[PDB]
A paper describes a structure:
Adhesive chaperone-usher pili are long, supramolecular protein fibers displayed on the surface of many bacterial pathogens. The type 1 and P pili of uropathogenic [name] (UPEC) play important roles during urinary tract colonization, mediating attachment to the bladder and kidney, respectively. [name] (type 1 pilus) and PapA (P pilus) assemble into a ∼1,000-subunit long helically coiled quaternary structure of ∼3–4 subunits per turn known as the rod (Habenstein et al., 2015, Hospenthal et al., 2017, Hospenthal et al., 2016). The biomechanical properties of the helical pilus rods allow them to reversibly uncoil in response to flow-induced forces, allowing UPEC to retain a foothold in the unique and hostile environment of the urinary tract.
Here we present the 4.2-Å resolution cryoelectron microscopy (cryo-EM) structure of the related type 1 pilus rod. Type 1 pili were expressed and assembled on the [name] cell surface, from which they were sheared and purified by density gradient centrifugation as described in STAR Methods. The resulting electron density map was resolved to an overall resolution of 4.2 Å, which is consistent with the map showing clearly separated strands and visible density for bulky side chains. The pilus rod is ∼72 Å in diameter and contains a hollow central lumen, which is ∼14 Å wide. Overall, the type 1 pilus is a right-handed superhelical assembly comprising 3.13 subunits per turn with an axial rise of 8.0 Å per subunit and a pitch of 25 Å. An extensive subunit-subunit interaction network maintains the integrity of the superhelical quaternary structure, where each subunit interacts with a total of eight other subunits, four preceding and four succeeding subunits (n interacts with +1, +2, +3, +4 and −1, −2, −3, −4). By far the largest contribution to the subunit-subunit interaction network is made by the main stacking interface between every n and n+3 subunit pair. The majority of this interface is formed by residues on the loops linking β strands C and D (βC-βD loop) and D and E (βD-βE loop). By contrast, the N-terminal portion of the [name] Nte lies flat against the remainder of the [name] pilin fold. In turn, this implies that the stacking interface is stronger in type 1 pili (Andersson et al., 2008, Andersson et al., 2007). These findings are indeed supported by our cryo-EM structure of the type 1 pilus rod, which has a larger buried surface area (1,616.2 Å2) in the n and n+3 (stacking) interface than the P pilus (1,453.0 Å2) (Hospenthal et al., 2016).
Numbering used by the authors:
A (entry chain F), B (entry chain E), C (entry chain B), D (entry chain A), E (entry chain D), F (entry chain C): 2 to 158
The structure:
Amino acid sequence: ATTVNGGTVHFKGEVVNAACAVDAGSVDQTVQLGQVRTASLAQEGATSSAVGFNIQLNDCDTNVASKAAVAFLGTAIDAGHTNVLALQSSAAGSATNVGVQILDRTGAALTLDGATFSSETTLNNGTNTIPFQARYFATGAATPGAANADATFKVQY
Amino acid sequence: ATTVNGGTVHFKGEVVNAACAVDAGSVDQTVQLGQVRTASLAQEGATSSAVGFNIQLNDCDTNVASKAAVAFLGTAIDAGHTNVLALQSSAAGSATNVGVQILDRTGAALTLDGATFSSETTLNNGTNTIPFQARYFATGAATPGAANADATFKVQY
Amino acid sequence: ATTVNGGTVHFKGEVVNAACAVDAGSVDQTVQLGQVRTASLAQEGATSSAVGFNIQLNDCDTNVASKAAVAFLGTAIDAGHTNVLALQSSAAGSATNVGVQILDRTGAALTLDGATFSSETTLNNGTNTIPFQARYFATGAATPGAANADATFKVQY
Amino acid sequence: ATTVNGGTVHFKGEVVNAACAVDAGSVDQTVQLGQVRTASLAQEGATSSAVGFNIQLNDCDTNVASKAAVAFLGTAIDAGHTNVLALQSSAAGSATNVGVQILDRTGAALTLDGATFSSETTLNNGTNTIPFQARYFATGAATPGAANADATFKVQY
Amino acid sequence: ATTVNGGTVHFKGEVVNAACAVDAGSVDQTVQLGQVRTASLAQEGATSSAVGFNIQLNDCDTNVASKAAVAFLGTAIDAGHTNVLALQSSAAGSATNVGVQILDRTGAALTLDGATFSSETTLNNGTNTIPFQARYFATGAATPGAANADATFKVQY
Amino acid sequence: ATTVNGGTVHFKGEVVNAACAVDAGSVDQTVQLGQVRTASLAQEGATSSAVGFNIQLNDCDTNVASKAAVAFLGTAIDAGHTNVLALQSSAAGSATNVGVQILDRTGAALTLDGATFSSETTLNNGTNTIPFQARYFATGAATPGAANADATFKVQY
């Protein structure tokens, strides 16, 4: 009695054929960076502190593959600096001459092409986790405003 | 001085005459499933792990009705299997011979007709929450690709 | 002062005498299919992935009728295959030996005659929504080009 | 080499001398009304729900004029009811004893004479938009069939 | 080799000459209201709970202007109640004798004329955000059905 | 009993013979730019912040082709500046001496001819995504008004 309709529910997923699958808690997330002062970013080559995140992998069989690495794809700020993201801004006066890198666990930047791969990682029989860091990078004088970036990634076995 | 026009803002809502109303945070949402390997879906009757969601109800008076149940409506993959969604794909080569079910809290699939109702649930004077789960189901051999589903629902008092 | 004429505005609507009326957002719409490769459509009986749409009904009284179904009317590609649309092309070299079906929620094709009706659907006191799917179908070898189809429909109480 | 003629292309436009000009996307458009049941239109004074549209104005200087209003011109169904359109039908048995009004943002009908003007509207330096609504109106008992209306308009500064 | 055409991409934007510009994430959005029971809207003067939204402003210089306020423009349900939206319905039997207001941060309704402005707001050198609320309002007895509204806005410096 | 006709439904799609097909969610879309102040666009060579979009590809086989790139086709504002769109305006006083570019992931403008191609991109076995950015560009002094652009594209394997 007194039946009423509801709303709508969507679904998102994938079916892949590889060694180890990507956890559902890491297909889309949001890492914060907080704020950073212009006095810490004065000249070219300036660098702030870094925060970290991770990529979780589940149902990981060692008998079909041994190691794993990743690769990233974004948008360079300049053809001279081929390792810094551009700014996925809101087209309403964001910051100028800034950018964010991606640091490997070995401690180096990555080439944003989708072909440069990172170092290897030995796996287990189950849950595996690979950490990464990110930090701001400047190519000169900094300006106040806003800053947002966005990128995708890709793994290899 | 210097007045400038803005943009446009829309509104969506309903007015219903029933016992307990649907929360605004659950008329439209998006639950992720992540990924799943083809090796876990080999033969007919294959089953992966399940994630969960919930439906929130507010302003719920016990004096006009006691219990509540739901029902779902989608699209079957086959007339033999009357409890599995089809794939609301992008018509660009998604996965084949897969599908997603809906598991009740009593632990059974539901008939996608909009007439089969679930078990009852005792209510409170205020916020009430009913949980559900979903998981992948196969009817044979699996293929790589993509997978998206979509369905609506309907309650009863 | 300084009065200037404007343009012209048209109106389209209907007045029907039935149980439940058709929403204004679904008397005329356009569903996309994107693209599809010829390698996925090789032999007779080939099938691609499917996208979905819906028909919305409003002001729906249960006291005058209980269930509802639909029927479609188009143009067959052949008298042997009485369930596939032809191609409402632009007469400038579109694709050959392709076509689009309509899948019911029970998971079957429909006979394009305007007399074959689909399965029933229980109604509410208000907004009701009935989903459907569509996908490409081939009767042999496929050719590149373009593809457009068009059809009408009809309901029953 | 191998030159072939094409087709024909037309042009439509105006040159006016006033404060603010009419956008090209609103000299001719088509607003739908969907359907409406005869049970909602039973006696004289019956009223259905309303949909809305808008008129867009561009290059609007405030220094030459301040406010603006509109006026409409159509065909009355009766000399007693001087605010309801007639039915621009197809002379093949459309609906009887129906009609459509035009509601101002202040919430009143308009006199279809081309001399009754609406309320004022303060302007900006650029894009301005004035909304309006329309709904069905009856003067007695309704009949099934079809319904189409058409009208023009005129502004004032 | 094997070059294939793509689709079509559009663009929307504005160029304004003022103090502080409107963020791209708020020129067009959609706020939900969920559902509301008829028992909470019984007599004239009835009121339900409220949800909130905000308007984001970027690249905001304090040296050219100090404060800011907004104004709204819609369609009144009645000339007696000059602060309640009408219902931008689908002309297929939506709800009757309902409506939605707009509450300022000072806690008052707004006059839907496009000339009544709200209270001031002190600005920063960059991102600024102004919140607002909305809730259902009734002028008598409520009916079941649907409810949709739509309005535009306009700022001042 | 009491059968009533419905409306009309259209279909749009393509059949192509290439390596990787275009997703249905990206044959036609609309990216917003919001607003931008005239003070940020003062002289020739002025530049605002950028927003981003992407092109999704599905059912992508690596065994028939390896890399992919795109090309664009629009309308230049001048024969001296062969990389800036014109303004697909409404012929009612839009902005003057503005325009929008397209930035590659390598960080350069593109020649609007339909023959200049972008950089390569390594592919996967399935879903692939290629990002791009867009921003306003000026060739002198800016004017207030409106701004809309439109372009098509084309891929290569």
